[PDB]
Design a protein around this ligand. Structure first.
Ligand SMILES: Nc1ncnc2c1ncn2[C@@H]1O[C@H](COP(=O)(O)OP(=O)(O)NP(=O)(O)O)[C@@H](O)[C@H]1O
Ligand SMILES: Nc1ncnc2c1ncn2[C@@H]1O[C@H](COP(=O)(O)OP(=O)(O)NP(=O)(O)O)[C@@H](O)[C@H]1O
Ligand SMILES: [Mg+2]
Ligand SMILES: [Mg+2]
Lengths: 344, 333
């Protein structure tokens, strides 16, 4: 009843839930490519297309053919050097998925200015390779998103405005923590307007970026946070030992009356410079803050820096070593940070 | 803090503030725009449209800016509005779903300060008040040059009104003492010709004749595909008395969009001087041209544009214009 292509269509649809997820996948790939410059161009807010341009390492020409194919034991076994082909691609699920539920194009180069333009069909095969030029880096273009998921596409049209803002929030997250990276975001309107949406300067402190990304009001009520949670006496599994110290740097709203937010609409948390979904740590943030200002939620921009060695259908749901202790040492450490702020 | 200085550089005067509002309404697909000044804008300026409203999702960043070839216009989302929040007090009554509406209040930084409920037809009403209040120098300048400043602003609205055949424009000024005065009014779905009469009156079409010209610039492209420019509109004839005593009615548009293109008007003016040296011509010209042939982001003025290979454009436009006038006089008798 349901043919293989459909299965591929539906599954890839489970991978790229919406425009925002697609964007996440593209930004992540660029950062992974060691880009220091990332440009994102939306056409009609995403309805038409999204383009991600970086100056990263680019894609090795040998990977072109296997970049967006889905990995199947059955098809790999059809190669003489199985070990070899499995190092030429079949990585991840993103590009492989954007192929099934969208039109994927790539322009890349590992040797500027000689470059290639690749068109991949729904199944990962290269329908056309065109000679072109471009500086070091890669450009990924996702167009006609969900063109073969009528129901989802239709929903996208009657909710594109909210979707974009959701997608913008996520772009703001990447831009605030990635100081060594310059982000630029434009939206080209059907009426021919190139509307600048967001921009940060390369080599900008988190502060300079919050101010760019949220205007002068962005810092209003904010106070620097510089904490060190010593967790060494809390590691559980016995063996130049690991220094289990967590450095928490960033900014958070001061408990001062009013200085907070009416909504928990502006909270960002990072673990080793990467947006992470720390549900637990936010709950803690919120409660500890209530005790000082009940009628408001705190704006958050905190980076948890620590060794990944002590770090373990969605994404990067991270769990730290003995998270229960962490949560407690943080709760009191922050609380006492606010108490010290009141005395100010 | 140093935010308002930046705002002041963005919204230099009343006119600029109005362009910002009018463009937003037009961008919102309104076919009805009504502008109300209270004391020529010294107290406030109200722009009401029947556009598609502001989706609730955009409220938060509505007045926030997230910063610092086949394109025709350049935009800096949030810049205009956050700048109006800076040097002034901004109010908003919008809705994408009538008959229920939201009334927003922003402070100088953009933080929403009040969101109460009301009602209105589909659309948006933007209220700008106390323009430049926190900028004394200019604030006073304004109140001391409001006449030329208002005239400069009305002329810009007159520019929009005339070319936007799909929109019904209406403009009023409420005196400090109380009653409303209709200053501008156009019926919608009207030709430039009809609008010229509505905006200026019985004598608006005086001595004006049609202009339908084509400028071929194909062989004037250096540094690099059909570079032709369809120039349509009206211009005064050169016969005695058929012109204006001054350049108070010279409008140029590029792709149905208003722009300041002095060099072209300069061309029109000097070419006209060739036949008449006591008057200037009334000009209403639209220049159709492929976007790819329009260079954007040429100066801090997000609206200022530069035509592909201007140098020649003028030259061909000047001679083409001359032939126009020569051909024109032939059928005088
Ligand atoms: N912008 C880019 N620059 C260079 N290579 C890229 C870029 N985007 C994608 N690729 C290549 O495409 C392959 C995978 O894309 P993707 O489908 O996101 O999987 P992944 O990055 O390997 N895994 P994941 O981290 O889970 O997304 C990568 O392993 C790269 O080799
Ligand atoms: N009258 C209106 N109706 C609907 N939406 C509006 C209106 N005025 C403003 N907006 C919204 O507010 C946002 C921007 O205001 P503005 O600050 O002028 O930037 P912009 O229009 O995006 N760019 P620019 O053309 O460079 O000014 C728009 O992008 C709309 O989403
Ligand atoms: Mg990836
Ligand atoms: Mg605008």
């Amino acid at each position: 009843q349901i043919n293989d292509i459909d299965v591929h269509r539906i599954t890839s649809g489970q991978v790229i839930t919406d425009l925002t997820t697609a964007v996440k996948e593209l930004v992540d790939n660029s950062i992974d490519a060691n880009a220091n410059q990332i440009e994102i161009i939306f056409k009609d807010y995403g309805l038409e297309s999204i383009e991600c341009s970086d100056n990263g390492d680019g894609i090795d020409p040998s990977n072109y053919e296997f970049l967006a194919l889905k990995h199947y034991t059955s098809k790999i076994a059809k190669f003489q050097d199985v070990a070899k082909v499995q190092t030429l691609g079949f990585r991840g699920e993103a590009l492989s998925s954007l192929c099934g539920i969208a039109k994927l194009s790539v322009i890349t180069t590992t040797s500027p200015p000689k470059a290639d333009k690749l068109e991949y069909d729904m199944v990962g095969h290269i329908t056309s390779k065109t000679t072109t030029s471009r500086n070091k880096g890669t450009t990924v273009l996702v167009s006609q998103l969900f063109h073969n998921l009528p129901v989802r596409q239709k929903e996208f049209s009657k909710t594109f405005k909210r979707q974009f803002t959701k997608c913008l929030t996520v772009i703001q997250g990447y831009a605030i923590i990635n100081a060594a990276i310059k982000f630029s975001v434009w939206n080209i309107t059907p009426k021919g307007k190139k509307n600048l949406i967001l921009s940060t300067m390369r080599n900008s402190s988190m502060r300079k970026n919050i101010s760019s990304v949220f205007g002068a009001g962005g810092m209003r009520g904010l106070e620097e946070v510089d904490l060190v949670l010593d967790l060494n006496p809390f590691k559980n599994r016995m063996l130049l030992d690991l220094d289990y110290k967590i450095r928490v740097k960033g900014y958070i709203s001061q408990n001062s009356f009013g200085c907070g937010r009416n909504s928990k609409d502006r909270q960002f948390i990072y673990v080793n410079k990467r947006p992470v979904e720390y549900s637990t740590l936010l709950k803690c943030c919120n409660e500890v803050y209530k005790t000082f200002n009940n009628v408001q939620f705190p704006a958050v921009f905190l980076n948890l820096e620590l060794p990944m060695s002590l770090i373990d259908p969605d994404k990067r749901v991270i769990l730290l070593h003995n998270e229960r202790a962490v949560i407690d040492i943080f709760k009191t450490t922050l609380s006492d940070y606010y108490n010290r702020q009141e005395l100010a």
